[PDB]
Write a protein that binds this ligand. Structure first.
Ligand SMILES: *[C@@H]1O[C@H](CO)[C@@H](O[C@@H]2O[C@H](CO)[C@@H](O[C@@H]3O[C@H](CO)[C@@H](O)[C@H](O)[C@@H]3O)[C@H](O)[C@H]2NC(C)=O)[C@H](O)[C@H]1NC(C)=O
Length: 486
């Protein structure tokens, strides 16, 4: 029942690894393999299931699959025109050496959120497999992943995705025919057991929905992996064709997950073995994919499907943790901090970084209780700190290092003053339209995120141009300036 569950996890992890010891569509399918991880498939299964959200509020699968599109036509071509090897390069030359390090901290935080999401998904899967508590399972998974990252001493992304694709598409047909599950064509409009899974956006929340969509479709462009892969390709048309293939792949991958949420929503949980309380009354509603894959499906198929899905995700953490640790070692720390790989220095620092990243990721995975919340917050700080300047480096002329600090502080001021519902923080500026959610944390209905980004943008050029006239004639001697961008 339970102890055989470990064999299911172990037997697949080897195959995904031994085969890792061993025409252009492979590029598209390995670009699709960065975004479709352990959050997509589990968060967009949450968004449909939770009452009061529905499909209309599951804006992330559409958001990222459109960010991959808007990247190719507009950002891919003009980056290659000046030969930037990576996203770090444009910040270094025109904003100086050190500002590049300080402009990558929000990216590190975003990667920390993303890493926490995978730990959260893995914990739930292991918990349903062997009936252990969440509080222990996520810790165990974090320990295993962090240890294997450094004690471990080739197409690994292709294999992991071709296991998820088969695993989900083999169980969903069988669950949909279960006696408990009813017609899915009627519970999308007339609420047989719970509110219809096809969501709604009222006249009040239009601005909030548009603001979230802009945040979540314009905050995926400046990520590191996409711009690393696009820049490497030899042909410019090759890059955009790969981008469109990746968008298509994500859209096709987003179909099995939606059906799982609908199956979970349209079910009579009093007839199956989950008891009278629904997964919503008991605050266990992120487990919707594992729950429907285990209880509704028969014995043999669940043993294949759940094991394959878990083992596919297990190989995602090793890439992300190591990439973020190397990121911290080289871009945030080493720049202008002269050290070499000696006894007490950078490689020891990178060894230590892995432990801190794992501990922070699991600590935040334990505190927050929603995967979709983490996979939403992973695209906020980047959206409001990096993209506003990434626009000005590429197209705007005359941006100086002076302008960067003003926008940096101005956007963060409005963002942290606004407050967050997911992470418990109470607003301080109290934008009009605020209403209480749960008698506790207040929630605002004003596009303060987009307002903050736009304000950062319009101060970046303004103060930067002010400095240029400030350092020429009539107002200020040139000598007394901390930096010299003139
Ligand atoms: C799903 O829920 C239904 C109803 O909530 C459960 O069915 C009911 O189970 C009770 C338990 O013995 C049956 O006994 C009845 O109890 C009431 C209590 O007042 C009594 O007044 C009746 O004379 C009778 O003894 C009841 O007949 C039964 N009702 C139906 C329509 O089946 C059911 O057990 C739950 N679980 C499932 C279906 O897996």
């Amino acid at each position: 029942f339970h102890v055989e569950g470990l064999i299911a996890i172990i037997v697949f992890y080897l195959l995904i690894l031994l085969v890792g010891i061993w025409g252009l569509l492979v590029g598209g399918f390995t670009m699709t393999a960065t975004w479709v991880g352990g959050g997509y498939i589990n968060g967009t299964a949450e968004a449909v299931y939770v009452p009061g959200y529905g499909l209309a509020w599951a804006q992330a699968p559409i958001g990222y699959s459109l960010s991959l599109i808007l990247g190719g036509l507009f950002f891919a071509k003009p980056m290659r025109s000046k030969g930037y090897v990576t996203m770090l390069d444009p910040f270094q030359q025109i904003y100086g050496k050190r500002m590049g390090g300080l402009l990558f901290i929000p990216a590190l935080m975003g990667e920390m959120f993303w890493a926490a999401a995978i730990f959260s998904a893995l914990g739930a899967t292991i918990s349903v497999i062997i009936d252990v508590d969440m509080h222990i399972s996520v810790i165990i998974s974090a320990l295993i992943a962090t240890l294997y990252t450094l004690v471990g001493g080739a197409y690994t992304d292709v294999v992991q995705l071709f296991c998820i694709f088969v695993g989900l598409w083999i169980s969903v047909p069988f669950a949909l025919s279960h006696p408990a599950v009813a017609d899915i064509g009627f519970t999308a409009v007339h609420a047989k057991y719970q509110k219809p899974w096809l969501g709604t956006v009222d006249s009040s929340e239009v601005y909030s929905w548009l603001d979230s969509f802009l945040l979540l479709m314009l905050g995926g462009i400046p990520w590191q992996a996409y711009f690393q892969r696009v820049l490497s390709s030899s042909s410019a048309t090759y890059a955009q064709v790969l981008s469109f293939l990746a968008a298509f792949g994500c859209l096709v991958m987003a179909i099995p997950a939606i059906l799982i949420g609908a199956i979970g929503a349209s079910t009579d949980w009093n007839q199956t073995a989950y008891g009278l309380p629904d997964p919503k009354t008991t605050e266990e509603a992120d487990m919707i994919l594992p729950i429907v894959l285990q209880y509704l499906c028969p014995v043999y198929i669940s043993f294949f499907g759940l094991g394959a899905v878990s083992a596919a995700v297990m190989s995602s953490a090793d890439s992300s943790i190591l990439s973020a640790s190397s990121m911290f070692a080289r871009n945030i720390y080493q720049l202008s901090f002269r050290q070499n790989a000696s006894d007490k220095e950078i490689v020891w620092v990178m060894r230590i970084t892995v432990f801190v990243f794992g501990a922070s990721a699991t600590a935040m995975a334990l505190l927050t209780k929603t995967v979709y919340g983490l996979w939403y917050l992973s695209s906020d700080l980047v959206y409001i700190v990096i993209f506003p300047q990434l626009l000005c480096v590429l197209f705007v002329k005359g941006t100086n290092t002076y302008g960067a600090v003003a926008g940096y502080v101005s956007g963060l001021f409005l963002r942290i003053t606004g407050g967050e519902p997911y992470l418990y923080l109470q607003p301080l500026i109290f934008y009009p339209g605020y209403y209480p959610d749960d008698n506790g944390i207040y929630n605002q209905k004003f596009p303060f995120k987009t307002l903050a980004m736009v304000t950062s943008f319009l101060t970046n050029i303004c103060i930067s141009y002010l400095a240029k006239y400030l350092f020429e004639s009539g107002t200020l001697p040139p000598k007394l300036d901390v930096f010299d961008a003139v």
